[PDB]
Design a protein around this ligand. Structure first.
Ligand SMILES: *[C@@H]1O[C@H](CO)[C@@H](O[C@@H]2O[C@H](CO)[C@@H](O)[C@H](O)[C@H]2NC(C)=O)[C@H](O)[C@H]1NC(C)=O
Ligand SMILES: *[C@@H]1O[C@H](CO)[C@@H](O[C@@H]2O[C@H](CO)[C@@H](O)[C@H](O)[C@H]2NC(C)=O)[C@H](O)[C@H]1NC(C)=O
Ligand SMILES: *[C@@H]1O[C@H](CO)[C@@H](O)[C@H](O)[C@H]1NC(C)=O
Ligand SMILES: *[C@@H]1O[C@H](CO)[C@@H](O)[C@H](O)[C@H]1NC(C)=O
Ligand SMILES: *[C@@H]1O[C@H](CO)[C@@H](O)[C@H](O)[C@H]1NC(C)=O
Lengths: 164, 322, 321, 161, 323, 162
């Protein structure tokens, strides 16, 4: 979207990965499988939760009884009251509507950023030892077993292993 | 041997709008808009509302023969009238500062009704029994407000009366009284012998002299005469004085009262129940943490801001793909 | 053999502001701020406004001899007075709940004026012709409001009068009347023989007795006496009763009326025209979809929010190089 | 914000008049500009929606602001004046800030689109061309017109050299 | 082996700020958008200082309560200051009509000179203008009364119909005040104004009202079972006002040539008044600030920041802080 | 945060660099040292300043005297006044609170962007002549003297190198 990752150079998402928002899909001699990025996913959940909570928690209201009664000879102040009520209605409706539109735009870009960053993290980790397919996929030049895939997720990937 | 990097997806159909794009399907979302009420009138802080049901404030405080339900509750968070509750001031007249009174009574901390001027001992020189009318019927019989007494002459004699009450409660006392305007100068002397009369009410802050305006008003509930209703709050330690040579509808019951501002009055058919709520609407109570609600503009309590929106769906997940 | 990737540019000079940078030149942009009006007073809903021109509401409803040309209208969306329209209550006095009345009359659905108390048949025991004054001149001649009649004694006799109207229309009836306060007790008996008089008006909801306050007020339009004007709305099926031993300026014309809330009154010199508008200001109408306008704070209709901003230029294109 | 517009691509092309983002090819068959059809239309759609959202969300009531009060109602007159000036300050501030905010974002939105269009082609021809650094690619293998096509269509599907 | 790194600033700063995504984020630099600081003083508003009544309230000040004798030396003021404990106003029990409206009209004045509309010596030749004092308005043990009004009583068993008129020859509006006295008993009535059935009439080009004394025993207030209602009106330049009474009229002595400028109010506070400038005033003190928001006080006078319930509005300008 | 630079692949900041927001730390045979990126830092200062000024300057208020007086028989309009006052209080508080939260989020991301961009600028300048350590650090393959480090900061870097 804004970061070119989600619905970008990574065209689609994985219905298979159900344990997190962002993750990996390994493919070696020991089989295949999906696996969410524990730390990366939890961080978004925390921040997104905080976001939703901020939008809600910041609305601290007074104890008020809207609604007034006026007799047939107080139509003016009745309409004054009606004006202040409709005045607040237009103000809150507009802000609320726009707040949602704005925050939604940002949130989607927030996820795009997290995916793009997770890719950059791995790519700048295995420079030569693997080539970019271009689909958010890395093809290993050196055989990579399961305990090897681990050193990539944990971000603890040794290098000294360049082959051909 | 390949390793791919991707994102979540699911069967979700939730859509949300952005500044750039409408109807965007997302994996997860929350609704910021509360659009759900329990269709009930519930209790406010911890106290229930005062339900007049058949009657309106006017009828309730004056003591209309129809609003004779209960020894009413000593406190209430707000007041509930029904859109069809008609029984108020049965005798045609003008309730002065009625709206102001309703506001002052909207929410009360303590509220005990007492007999300010005992019927038996208070008026020895005037008739306190003949004061009934066909405009205020209670089971076929002619009757009148319970909290007021229509003092008429005692056999061709209406001596200048003078009664005073001194607020010995610890709180404000709400005192109500009426002034009667006969239709004809004959009805005038028929009721209070004297032709040229006057009524005077006075306290430390209140003071007003009343002159009966005698004339034929168009028939209302059978009455060509009128009766205006007045009220005032007597501060603790203060005293109020009544004085009349006729036409005075004297107080019988008053109200020791302590009020807490910040409430109002709901006109609704919605049933009252035994439940808690932090926010009340004429359509029902609202239990929510959300910032906005589109249920009703007129609200009572600590409520969400009323919005014209139909849906405020906030995206939490990401775009949904297969 | 090269391939480059770039972006658009043009002769545009449009500038916009951002949170980080001011006066940023941009390829394309739209204005969110409506600052353009047609300098005309137009029809609001589908209906045109009621223009009093020379007169104000007071003069118009009472029937000031000068407001004789006006209301060819059975409905209006709002009312227009001119800042210099002075002709209202020619006889000095106090118009009670005037502002409230103006509000109630601001917009009406149906509005027909009828003769509630016909001059010829209604007052047989009182003089309904001598009731004119130099305070209400119509072409040099002494005259008076058209919708009221100043009942005076009929040759040294002013019998207690009692007239009632019963609202047989299907709508509310606006009834107006006046109470006259002579300057001297001599003027009092000169006009209504009786010295101690009273007037009483009463319906199902209204009820008030009036006592003439006789005294010398400072001359206004030649009058040391005063005349207060009252009004009330009689519900359908209800009846209103007038009763006086003098000093009563009786109703002649009333108004069968059906009102629709939500409108107001514009005081402006701006010409009224035959055009549609969804939003009206004293300076002119506003045709726009924009959310904001800086034309005028006082508005009538479904309008854009008034803002103090001078320009709200929203960028749609990109930086211009 | 994305370093593209007025970044590593210093200026814009007055020559490219058919779109917001595009290319400028240079081979043996000549030169020329050409907007990226799909890329440009997308921005137009979204930017249009943006402008429409800011406008369309403002749904107002039918109201007659302005009240009349007599010389003995100055208090409620000032109350009315307060509610009017209260709304004036609120709307002015929000409108002013809304513009400032949305303009900032819009300019960054375009920066993003250009940066993305560059990334798209760069990750398409890896070795077959070298980055000049000015948002320009210099081909190592001769590239004819029907070749430039396979780059725009994103169908540069055969890395021959 | 040769090399070059790219990084960002950091410092000893402890400033924290909140974001939509994260709370308590330490930053290198920041500014506060929230003004929470006042000078605890009541200062001048535009150029002008406020009118301080101190001991008295508006009622007492304009009527001329014997206690508010020290004050009316200002010809203009930006706003008015009463103290929460200033109780001296209408010493004689009564009803001040449209009092709140008056207070509003007087809240801020451009020019304000007090003059003797009806000179005591020359105005009332057929009535007693000296006996009109009461124990309800004491000035140093002695019975006294408002300075701006005169309680006209009968002159030895005679109270002739009086009729006095003033014509506004100033260039501005004139504020005229007067009272109507309602005796407690019909005996007190004839004792003061011989006539039993009396009336008072006031009238100008716009004002007109006839007053009937309502005689009765009200509960004792400051020793008075009788009452006294106070009225006021603004007479337009060139207009004239007429007083006429057969008794019970507390006539005007001093009026006020006055030019008013709307847009101000009244502060009830103990906060001391000083000689300082301010563009924004609160009951707690003045506010000197450019910030958009303040949480000092909701009730404000002048060109002020919007009142907010927030405790801190810290805006980040620098970046995240690391060691 | 959003761009992966600050507190990302560049874990921490330099207390040593006190003359700017973003900068470099060179390491060659002529010694070591920090140095802020003049142009890059000034730009952020200008824009961030404008930001703060926009949030403040756009708030143009009327001259008004809040606060009204009502007598014991005007409690209704008194409460109406109270309603309009508390109505504005809730509106402004919420907007102000949210405005800060939003703008702070953006500002921090704004700096993340500037650092990421400064890195990208250098990296795409010396392609082979140096290898990415991965810590926002470049290790030169060709010896780089002081007047050489200059051609990197000025963005005027040549490529004869091995
Ligand atoms: C109380 O309220 C009712 C309803 O408005 C009054 O009106 C009539 O009461 C009679 C007697 O039972 C009924 O026959 C009518 O149906 C009622 N009217 C209508 C339209 O419902 C009734 O008079 C009132 N009684 C008192 C004492 O106030
Ligand atoms: C002004 O205020 C003072 C104080 O309230 C009034 O004095 C009171 O009068 C009574 C009557 O004897 C004393 O017992 C009280 O002690 C007084 N209060 C105080 C604080 O001394 C005084 O009457 C007022 N004077 C006027 C004309 O307003
Ligand atoms: C999707 O978006 C369009 C444009 O707003 C709208 O007309 C429609 O209601 C939406 N469609 C559905 C199926 O809800
Ligand atoms: C830049 O801003 C200034 C100050 O607001 C303004 O007067 C000027 O017109 C602007 N420059 C241009 C060319 O728009
Ligand atoms: C941080 O620490 C020291 C010790 O207080 C202080 O002197 C210095 O001013 C601080 N650094 C900065 C740049 O403020």
């Amino acid at each position: 979207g804004l970061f070119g990752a989600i619905a970008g150079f990574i065209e689609g998402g994985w219905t298979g990965m159900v344990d997190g928002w962002y993750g990996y899909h390994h493919q070696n001699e020991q089989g295949s499988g999906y696996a969410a990025d524990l730390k990366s996913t939890q961080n978004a959940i925390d921040e997104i939760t905080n976001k939703v909570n901020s939008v809600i928690e910041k609305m601290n209201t007074q104890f008020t009884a809207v609604g007034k009664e006026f007799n047939h000879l107080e139509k003016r102040i009745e309409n004054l009251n009606k004006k202040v009520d409709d005045g607040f209605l237009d103000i809150w409706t507009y802000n609320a509507e726009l707040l949602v539109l704005l925050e939604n735009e940002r949130t989607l870009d927030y996820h795009d950023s997290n995916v793009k960053n997770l890719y950059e993290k791995v790519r700048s980790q295995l420079k030569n030892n693997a080539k970019e397919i271009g689909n958010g996929c890395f093809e290993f030049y050196h055989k990579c077993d399961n305990t090897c895939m681990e050193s990539v997720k944990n971000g603890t990937y040794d290098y000294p292993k360049y082959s051909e | 041997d390949t390793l791919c990097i991707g994102y979540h997806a699911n069967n979700s159909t939730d859509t949300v709008d952005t500044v750039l794009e409408k109807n965007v399907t997302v994996t997860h979302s929350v609704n910021l808009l509360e659009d759900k009420h329990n269709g009930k009138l519930c209790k406010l802080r911890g106290v229930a509302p005062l339900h007049l049901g058949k009657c309106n404030i006017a009828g309730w405080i004056l003591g209309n023969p129809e609003c004779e339900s209960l020894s009413t509750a000593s406190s209430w968070s707000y007041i509930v009238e029904t859109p069809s509750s008609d029984n108020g001031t049965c005798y045609p007249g003008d309730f002065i500062d009625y709206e102001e009174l309703r506001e002052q009574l909207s929410s009360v901390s303590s509220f005990e009704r007492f007999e300010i001027f005992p019927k038996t001992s208070s008026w020895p020189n005037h008739d306190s029994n003949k004061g009934v009318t066909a405009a205020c019927p209670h089971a076929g019989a002619k009757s009148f407000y319970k909290n007021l007494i229509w003092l008429v002459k005692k056999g061709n004699s209406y001596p200048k009366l003078s009664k005073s009450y001194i607020n010995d409660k610890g709180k404000e006392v709400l005192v109500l009284w009426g002034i009667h305007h006969p239709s004809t100068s004959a009805d005038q002397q028929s009721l209070y012998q004297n032709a040229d009369t006057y009524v005077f009410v006075g306290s430390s802050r209140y003071s007003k002299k009343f002159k009966p305006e005698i004339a034929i008003r168009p028939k209302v509930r059978e009455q060509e005469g009128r009766m205006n209703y007045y009220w005032t709050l007597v501060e603790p330690g203060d005293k109020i004085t009544f004085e009349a040579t006729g036409n005075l509808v004297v107080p019988r019951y008053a109200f020791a009262m302590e009020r807490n501002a910040g409430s109002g009055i709901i006109i609704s058919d919605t049933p009252v129940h035994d439940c808690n709520t932090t926010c009340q609407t004429p359509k029902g109570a609202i239990n929510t943490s959300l910032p906005f609600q589109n249920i009703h503009p007129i609200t009572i309590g600590k409520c969400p801001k009323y919005v014209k929106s139909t849906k405020l769906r906030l995206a939490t997940g990401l775009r949904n793909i297969p």
